[PDB]
Amino acid sequence: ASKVKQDMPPPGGYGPIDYKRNLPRRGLSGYSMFAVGIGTLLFGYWSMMKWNRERRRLQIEDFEARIALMP
């Protein structure tokens, strides 16, 4: 006298299954990104300004060495 055994869902039911789209925001604001970009640009401009002025002075020194050696 064996009872019926068959593939059935568990008593109660199965757990919920997600189906809706899940695309989070995961980002900053436009103002923040623009601000960081401009800040990086300004820092780079300042550094290159100092470096290029120093390079101009070094080139002047090299040219003076050449001038002293020319005669």
């Binding site: 019926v4 593939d7 869902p9 039911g13 199965y14 299954i17 189906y19």
Partner: protein, 54 residues
Amino acid sequence: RKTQPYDVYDQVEFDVPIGSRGDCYDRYLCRVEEMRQSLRIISQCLNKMPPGEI
């Protein structure tokens, strides 16, 4: 499945995706949403499988 249902399609709940522009992008969105609705129908079918002969 909604207008002329067959088998037990009248006992499941799902939405029908509808486009607006009639282009390839809208059809791609429709197919993605149809996959989501198929997941919905599969969950309903899994929780509602009856016993009996096949």
